[PDB]
Write a protein that binds this ligand. Structure first.
Ligand SMILES: Cc1cc2nc3c(=O)[nH]c(=O)nc-3n(C[C@H](O)[C@H](O)[C@H](O)COP(=O)(O)OP(=O)(O)OC[C@H]3O[C@@H](n4cnc5c(N)ncnc54)[C@H](O)[C@@H]3O)c2cc1C
Ligand SMILES: Cc1cc2nc3c(=O)[nH]c(=O)nc-3n(C[C@H](O)[C@H](O)[C@H](O)COP(=O)(O)OP(=O)(O)OC[C@H]3O[C@@H](n4cnc5c(N)ncnc54)[C@H](O)[C@@H]3O)c2cc1C
Ligand code: SF4
Ligand code: SF4
Ligand code: SF4
Ligand code: SF4
Ligand code: SF4
Ligand code: SF4
Ligand code: SF4
Ligand code: SF4
Ligand code: SF4
Ligand code: SF4
Ligand code: SF4
Ligand code: FES
Lengths: 129, 380, 644, 335
């Protein structure tokens, strides 16, 4: 079983973190597909619900660490939305382990690689949605 | 004056009034003295089970709007926001009506300056057809003979055309699948303190309305209505003001028990929810009836969300999206569940989600004057 | 109708080694709207850019997708390539198949190729819905406004005027100087303060590039960076500023006595007054709360400069940048009922002592007991009055009270060698340059006594001597010492009218009640409101050199936009559909840059202020707000392509 | 402002309140007191308030050269009387008149001698029982032919109630992915009506057959089978007052007078003159147009598929220049 994982990564840190992981040649499972946004404040529940309804077994969102946002507050709004989404998701049979949101800096290639490995293992253990 | 006991000075109004006719007298004063331009109230149709909204521009024949209609689970906020937005107005509101109007006012859909809220105590409402079936099954009478209805010592009680009263324990009826609406059993708010005035009978004698003045605007209403002699007032005993507090506390405790029942113990399982969501016909009646869903164009009808085929929508892109949009502002008014052609218990899930959000953040939908913390511009 | 050209880069063997580029190109060829799908070894080179340009020119391509490396590495390169080809730079999309696919899945060539196909599909899905966008240019006016005429405001105005920018300085008081003009000497050098300040005030007063508007307040501010329209209300002096010479004849003949604001409540003047001899402008002012219209000033004035019929004036200015340098007020310790300020006669604040010690102050430089006007034989100083105290909601340090307490103690000892001075402190914050040596010299040279302990109470005796009940925490014992005078080390608070100005400009305040900077570390003088900068104590308590450094920095930051003369805004900004906007306004407070306002019941995004984050777009329920180049439809298409 | 009325979008007798402001319909409000639906409506029921304003024509018209041109009421009435009295006319109506209007039109037909008359419907004349839909839940066995949920959602609601209370529901259709097919207990996709009849052979007496107009060919046989085997038949007609009109007129060309105040007529074949008596004329180019008052602008009664009759007062004022069908009929008779 190969899970289908959709990722949202902010342009400034979390996309940079994945790029840093790539430059260092750190290997993680090929399952994730990354969509680029300017800020994690661009992500809302509609995107996550669409990803889950279109067949995603897990959904990852990666933003800047709290205080590091390139737009100074976007990740705060995203964090609020993410907590509410964690409330909403189990009501429709989606284990909240399938929804992973993390703060990754542009230099944390190892953090990105480990997060991807653990998320892939978790989703694989959970099985098809 | 926090508390008063008021009643109309017109004999017709007090006779026809449920509780001394104070509310009708306030409306008549407000229209006569031009405080407001109109009054939005209910009015029975061809029977006590048929309460239709009416917008009165003058007080002539206002006594036809007197009395309480427990079988009218109406919402006024949606009507005030869709069509009556640029009118100075006075409206009779149950606590759910006031909650809807507050959620719409913090979203600038209703102007708080232009709307006067004479809220009513509410212990629950009933669906009319269900109420008639209940009266046929348990009271063993023809429903057309019922002239009035009230809930009290735990009892739905019916006045009759003959003139007698028939009483049945509401606990029995609600355990037999009847009685107040399920959202009304979970209702945590009984006095409308999110209104200008709060009128009830929980601390009043016969022929008087117990009024709690919540705002300075309510004080102006009461002063103007007494000075011109539309309403006569006296002050509750403070032995009465305590009986009312105890009754309200007991009601709120029972509401919490029913929340723990319907939202935890009798909450449908995931399989039962799948069975329910299979039924949805994508008619959007729940969205249309919801007072908090006011948008001119709805996102649920966009090409990337809307269900194209003539089949049940994916519960995520319909229900989860509406939840992410407004579930922190759900007032548990039950309109969505009321209008659903498929008999889906929408309000249960929406109220459960709102309760989780409130427990985490402490935001009370329809009570707090501020927007939810979700829309906070601080970095809290 | 979209006509997409896809270009897969080998990157030598970096991508092609793991990812089968030929198969990816073949797959891209079949995708709808894809007209051509090629592949070249190094698309980041003149040959590859020429190939892309040639297909744009020959095959009539309106959308370009490059499958390669990071947008963060080479997006500007390919945007420039396509724009030189004549295609809008925002009709180009990038797929990352090297850092995200080929360098991280070297063990799974099949998985890498499938992932590359998925990513190219997502890129094409986004490209199908792209639109052409043009960057906007916003003109920046080269005139500046400085609010506040203190040392920080004076420094900022002089720096901006010396850089060639026409400047307007607005000061609410009749004269410029601020609090620094009220001090006698400055720590840690005990230098004459007015004598260093006065030359700068005179320079400001006759600078050709400075328009000084004293006794005026900023009534309204509209617009944005480079385009500020400011309405200023010049209060009536009742004296002709052009004709008055400041001789002071009118002051001598005035029969009314009025308090002097410059003496902080211990000195008096007349209803017609000049705040101090070194005032700029040297002009008289009449206060009509005390004038009786006797007209003596009229018949004594030799220049006919008295105008009892004057009216408030309205000034409209257009500026590009605003520097707020409004300073501070001294804390009012009347609420600290235990210390008895306002009740006990011989309890005074530090600023009153500054005015008393000043040789041109009301007492002519003599420190006298307010009760009997005699020199105090024993003086106590109390630290942290109004600061570091949660009983009054002031949990911050005012940062200057320790040093000015020690300075005033040293000045008292210099004036009166035999006087005994004691300081009651919690911590001695002598952190600045030469401050620790100042601290030591307070003891070694002048013999000032230091008691570590926050006094519990100050009690007035029948003879008006003051007993300070306090623990000596280092002796570990309660002490009750008597003093002829007690001075309170009052802290710094935002001035009166700070909130009105803050709402007028639209700024945000920090927890301590002062104005908030854009970034605490790297942007100390900037604000999230573009074109507005903070200088001096307006941003928070500090001493004169810190305020001067901040004022010069604010001048530099303000000059940068005015030097440029224009600002370029990338068109990834948010846009509102007025047909769908319900006017709910829940998006307004989510913009950290204040780019969203409400006009005619609909939300409007200011093009010049939007940074393109997309938070408001994600917050809008109905979808009336959308971000260019990151529209909801485009992201949904990318999600669908990624999963299907 | 808020006035009771009946939803005209299908045969189910759902009630709705129309909100009126300034003399025009502006929205809808739940009609909770109505026993058919209890304030529940499908999307069609919540958009009905726009029917009186959608492409409304309020002036009698006549076919001048090429295009329709306005004339007065007397001229159009007289020139319709011409065709009625002299040459020939076939009078066709949809289930959109009131019962009283249906009776008046039946009087017109016999007097002026119309050989061809009736109601446009695929159902036959049957001894349809009165079946209050509230009682649908009581039936032990229910068979459904067609997509009952999609045709009338608020009767599919009662089918769901019946399934909840243990009733065994079977659905028959030519399609395999439909709401009724999806949700019913057992579904059979058939290509021969014989299979449907053989499956109905096992239905006990008193069972309920709910038949929609989706398959017109099997209506005739099934009704026959329901008469032999003692079943209760619930038809789902096409128009809101099909059952009420059926009483006064039988289920029905050269020259047609088509009366459809509801604009619910699927296009029919006309060879000669075309006299249209409707509310909007967008679809065709009638020889003469007779604008009438809408469903909700009339006094009269309507019967739903189940048989629930509902007397109604005008919820809206008819636009100036139009007449109720009965006024036109009385003018035709008396003129
Ligand atoms: C459904 C319902 C439940 C109530 N439950 C309680 C309760 O548990 N405890 C309590 O103390 N009081 C309750 N009340 C209020 C009670 O009837 C008071 O005696 C009365 O409101 C006091 O004002 P009055 O009698 O002078 O008003 P009246 O002169 O009788 O005027 C009442 C006005 O309320 C309007 N109105 C607004 N919404 C409704 C509605 N949904 N149904 C009917 N009329 C409506 C009427 O049209 C009328 O204009 C309830 C009222 C309603 C409508
Ligand atoms: C008792 C005492 C002793 C001190 N001793 C020393 C010392 O020895 N050495 C040292 O380095 N520092 C000392 N300081 C600190 C020093 O005073 C400050 O660092 C400095 O004065 C800050 O200058 P500023 O221009 O930021 O503010 P301010 O000096 O307060 O000037 C602000 C100016 O803005 C004006 N203004 C305010 N609001 C408005 C408005 N709405 N519109 C227009 N104008 C407005 C004010 O009237 C004033 O002209 C001392 C402070 C105190 C209280
Ligand atoms: S939800 Fe609450 S306020 Fe509304 S009718 Fe029910 S009990 Fe009354
Ligand atoms: S979701 Fe349902 S219960 Fe909640 S406010 Fe909307 S209609 Fe009322
Ligand atoms: S579902 Fe969302 S967009 Fe639609 S009306 Fe409700 S809040 Fe508005
Ligand atoms: S009202 Fe019921 S059937 Fe209609 S869309 Fe909402 S949940 Fe679905
Ligand atoms: S575009 Fe990127 S992957 Fe291709 S050759 Fe240039 S640097 Fe290498
Ligand atoms: S007119 Fe006023 S300011 Fe002038 S001398 Fe008289 S009191 Fe003083
Ligand atoms: S008003 Fe005249 S007298 Fe007074 S200070 Fe000015 S110049 Fe001198
Ligand atoms: S600087 Fe010294 S006296 Fe002033 S608040 Fe800080 S610790 Fe207290
Ligand atoms: S853009 Fe959206 S959130 Fe902002 S005011 Fe308009 S409708 Fe409300
Ligand atoms: S996209 Fe971001 S920066 Fe632009 S207006 Fe919206 S919140 Fe402000
Ligand atoms: S089921 Fe039929 S009658 Fe009822 S609301 Fe829907 S379309 Fe109208
Ligand atoms: S920029 Fe990455 S979270 Fe705001």
């Amino acid at each position: 079983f190969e899970p289908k994982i959709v990722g949202f990564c902010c342009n400034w840190c979390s996309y940079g973190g994945a790029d840093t992981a790539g430059t260092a040649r750190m290997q993680y499972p090929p399952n994730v597909r990354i969509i680029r946004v300017m800020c994690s404040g661009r992500v809302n529940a509609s995107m996550i619900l669409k990803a889950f309804s279109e067949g995603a077994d897990g959904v990852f969102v990666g933003g800047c660490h709290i205080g590091d946002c390139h737009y100074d507050s976007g990740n705060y709004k995203w964090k609020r939305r993410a907590r509410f989404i964690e409330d909403i998701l189990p009501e429709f049979g989606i284990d909240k382990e399938r929804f992973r949101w993390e703060w990754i800096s542009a230099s944390e290639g190892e953090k990105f690689q480990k997060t991807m490995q653990e998320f892939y293992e978790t989703v694989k253990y959970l099985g098809p949605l | 004056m926090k508390y008063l006991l008021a009643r109309a000075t017109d004999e017709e109004i007090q006779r026809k009034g449920e509780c001394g006719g104070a509310v009708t007298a306030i409306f008549k004063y407000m229209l006569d003295k031009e405080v407001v331009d109109a009054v939005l109230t209910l009015e029975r149709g061809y029977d006590v089970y048929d309460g239709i909204p009416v917008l009165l521009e003058d007080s002539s024949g206002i006594e036809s709007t007197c009395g309480s209609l427990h079988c009218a689970p109406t919402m006024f906020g949606d009507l005030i926001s869709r069509y009556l937005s640029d009118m100075r107005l006075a409206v009779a509101v149950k606590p759910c009506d006031a909650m809807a109007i507050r959620e719409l006012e913090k979203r600038h859909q209703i102007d708080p300056d232009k709307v006067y809220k004479i809220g009513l105590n509410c212990g629950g409402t009933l669906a009319p057809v269900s109420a008639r079936e209940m009266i046929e099954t348990f009271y063993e009478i023809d429903p057309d003979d019922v002239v009035s209805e009230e809930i009290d010592r735990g009892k739905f009680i019916v006045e009759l055309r003959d003139g007698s009263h028939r009483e049945i324990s509401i606990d029995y009826l609600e355990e037999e699948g009847f009685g107040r609406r399920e959202n009304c059993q979970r209702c945590e708010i009984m006095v409308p303190r999110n209104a200008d005035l709060a009128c009830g009978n929980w601390g009043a004698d016969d022929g008087w309305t117990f009024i709690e003045v919540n705002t300075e605007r309510g004080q102006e209403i009461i002063e103007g209505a007494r000075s011109s002699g539309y309403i006569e007032a006296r002050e509750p005993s403070e032995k009465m003001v305590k009986i009312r507090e105890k009754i309200e506390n007991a009601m709120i405790s029972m509401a919490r028990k029913f929340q723990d029942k319907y939202l935890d113990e009798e909450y449908p399982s995931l399989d039962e929810w799948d069975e329910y969501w299979k039924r949805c016909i994508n008619c959007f009646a729940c969205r249309d009836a919801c007072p908090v869903c006011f948008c001119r164009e709805c996102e649920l009808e966009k090409d990337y969300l809307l269900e194209s085929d003539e089949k049940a929508p994916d519960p995520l892109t319909f229900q989860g999206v509406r939840l992410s949009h407004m579930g922190f502002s759900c007032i548990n008014c039950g309109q969505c569940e009321d209008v659903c052609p498929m008999d889906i218990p929408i309000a249960r899930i929406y109220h459960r989600i709102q309760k989780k959000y409130r427990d985490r953040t402490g935001f009370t939908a329809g009570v707090s004057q501020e927007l939810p913390p979700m829309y906070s511009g601080e970095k809290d | 109708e979209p006509k997409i050209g896809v270009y897969v880069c080998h990157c030598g063997v970096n991508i092609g080694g793991v990812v089968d580029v030929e198969a990816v190109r073949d797959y891209a060829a079949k995708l709808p709207n894809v007209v051509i799908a090629k592949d070249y070894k190094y698309y980041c080179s003149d040959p590859g850019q020429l190939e892309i340009q040639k297909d744009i020119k020959e095959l009539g391509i309106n959308r370009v997708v490059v499958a390669a490396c990071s947008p963060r590495l080479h997006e500007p390169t390919f945007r420039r390539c396509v724009e030189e080809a004549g295609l809008n730079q925002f009709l180009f999309e990038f797929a990352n198949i090297r850092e995200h696919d080929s360098w991280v899945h070297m063990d799974n060539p099949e998985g890498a190729t499938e992932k590359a196909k998925d990513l190219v599909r997502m890129a094409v899905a986004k490209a199908r819905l792209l639109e052409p966008l043009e960057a906007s240019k916003v003109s920046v006016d080269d005139k500046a406004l400085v609010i506040g005429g203190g040392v920080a405001g004076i420094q900022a105005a002089l720096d901006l005027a010396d850089m060639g920018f026409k400047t307007y300085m607005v000061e609410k008081r009749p004269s410029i100087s601020g609090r620094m003009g009220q001090l006698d000497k400055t720590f840690p050098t005990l230098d004459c303060s007015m004598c260093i300040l006065a030359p700068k005030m005179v320079d400001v007063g006759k600078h050709d590039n400075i328009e000084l508007i004293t006794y005026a307040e900023v009534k309204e501010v509209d617009g944005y960076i480079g385009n500020f329209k400011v309405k200023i209300e010049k209060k009536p002096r009742y004296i002709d500023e052009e004709l008055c010479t400041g001789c002071g004849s009118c002051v001598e003949v005035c029969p009314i006595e009025m308090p002097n604001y410059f003496d902080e409540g211990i000195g008096m003047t007349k209803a017609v007054y000049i705040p101090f001899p070194q005032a700029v402008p040297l002009c008289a002012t009449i206060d009509k709360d005390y004038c009786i219209e006797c007209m003596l000033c009229d018949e004594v004035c030799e220049r006919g400069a008295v105008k009892h019929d004057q009216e408030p004036e309205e000034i409209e200015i257009e500026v590009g940048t605003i520097i707020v340098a409004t300073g501070y007020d001294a804390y009012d310790p009347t609420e600290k009922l235990e210390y008895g300020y306002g009740r006990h006669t011989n309890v005074i604040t530090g600023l009153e002592l500054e005015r008393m010690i000043n040789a041109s102050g009301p007492t002519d430089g003599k420190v006298l007991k307010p009760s009997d006007g005699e020199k105090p034989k024993r003086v106590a100083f109390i630290h942290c009055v109004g600061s570091r105290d949660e009983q009054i909601g002031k949990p911050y340090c005012s940062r200057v009270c320790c040093m000015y307490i020690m300075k005033n103690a040293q000045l008292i000892k210099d004036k009166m060698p035999d006087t005994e001075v004691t300081l009651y402190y919690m911590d001695i914050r002598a952190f600045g340059k030469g401050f620790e040596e100042f601290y030591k010299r307070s003891q070694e040279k002048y013999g000032i006594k230091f008691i570590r302990g926050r006094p519990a109470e100050v009690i007035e005796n029948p003879d008006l001597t003051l007993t300070v009940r306090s623990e000596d925490t280092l002796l570990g014992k309660v002490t009750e010492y008597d003093y002829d005078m007690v001075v309170l080390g009052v802290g710094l608070v935002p001035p009166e009218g700070a909130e009105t100005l803050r709402q007028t400009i639209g700024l945000s305040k920090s927890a301590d009640g002062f104005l908030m900077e854009a970034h605490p570390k790297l942007r100390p003088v900037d604000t999230l409101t573009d074109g507005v900068y903070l200088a001096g104590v307006a941003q928070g308590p500090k001493d004169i050199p810190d305020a001067v450094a901040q004022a010069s920095g604010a001048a530099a930051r303000a000059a940068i936009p005015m030097v440029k003369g224009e600002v370029e805004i990338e068109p990834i900004i948010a846009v509102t559909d007025s047909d769908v906007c319900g006017g709910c306004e829940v998006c307004i407070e989510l913009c950290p840059f204040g780019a969203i306002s409400i006009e005619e019941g609909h939300a409007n995004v200011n093009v010049a202020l939007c940074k393109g984050c997309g938070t408001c777009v994600a917050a809008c329920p109905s979808g009336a707000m959308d971000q260019q180049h990151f529209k909801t439809e485009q992201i949904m298409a990318q999600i669908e392509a990624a999963l299907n | 402002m808020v006035k009771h009325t009946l939803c005209p979008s299908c045969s189910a007798g759902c009630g709705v309140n129309i909100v009126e402001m300034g003399g025009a319909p502006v929205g809808t409000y739940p009609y909770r007191r109505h026993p058919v639906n209890e304030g529940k409506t499908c999307r069609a029921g919540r958009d009905c308030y726009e029917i009186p304003l959608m492409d409304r024509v309020t002036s009698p018209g006549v076919k001048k050269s090429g295009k329709l041109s306005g004339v007065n009421w007397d001229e159009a009435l007289d020139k319709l009387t011409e065709l009625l009295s002299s040459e020939d006319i076939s009078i066709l109506t949809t289930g959109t008149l009131t019962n009283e209007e249906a009776l008046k039109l039946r009087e017109i037909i016999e007097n002026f001698n119309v050989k061809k008359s009736g109601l446009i419907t695929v159902f036959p004349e049957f001894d349809y029982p009165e079946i209050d839909i509230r009682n649908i839940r009581d039936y032990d066995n229910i068979a459904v032919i067609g997509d009952a949920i999609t045709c009338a959602p608020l009767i599919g609601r009662r089918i769901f109630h019946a399934m909840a209370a243990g009733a065994e529901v079977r659905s028959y259709d030519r399609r395999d992915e439909t709401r009724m097919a999806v949700n019913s207990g057992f579904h059979i996709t058939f290509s021969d009506e014989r299979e449907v009849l053989n499956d109905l052979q096992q239905l006990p007496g008193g069972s309920l057959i709910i038949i929609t107009p989706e398959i017109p060919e099997i209506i005739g046989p099934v009704l026959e089978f329901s008469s032999e085997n003692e079943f209760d038949v619930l038809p789902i007609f096409e128009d809101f007052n099909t059952r009420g009109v059926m009483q006064h007129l039988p289920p029905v060309f050269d020259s047609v007078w088509l009366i459809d105040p509801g604009a619910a007529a699927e296009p029919v074949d006309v060879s000669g003159k075309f006299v249209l008596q409707s509310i909007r004329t967008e679809g065709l180019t009638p020889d003469i147009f007779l604008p009438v008052a809408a469903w909700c602008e009339k006094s009269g009664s309507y019967t739903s598929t189940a048989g629930y009759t509902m007397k109604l007062e005008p919820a809206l004022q008819a636009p100036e220049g139009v007449l109720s069908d009965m006024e036109i009929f009385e003018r035709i008779l008396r003129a």
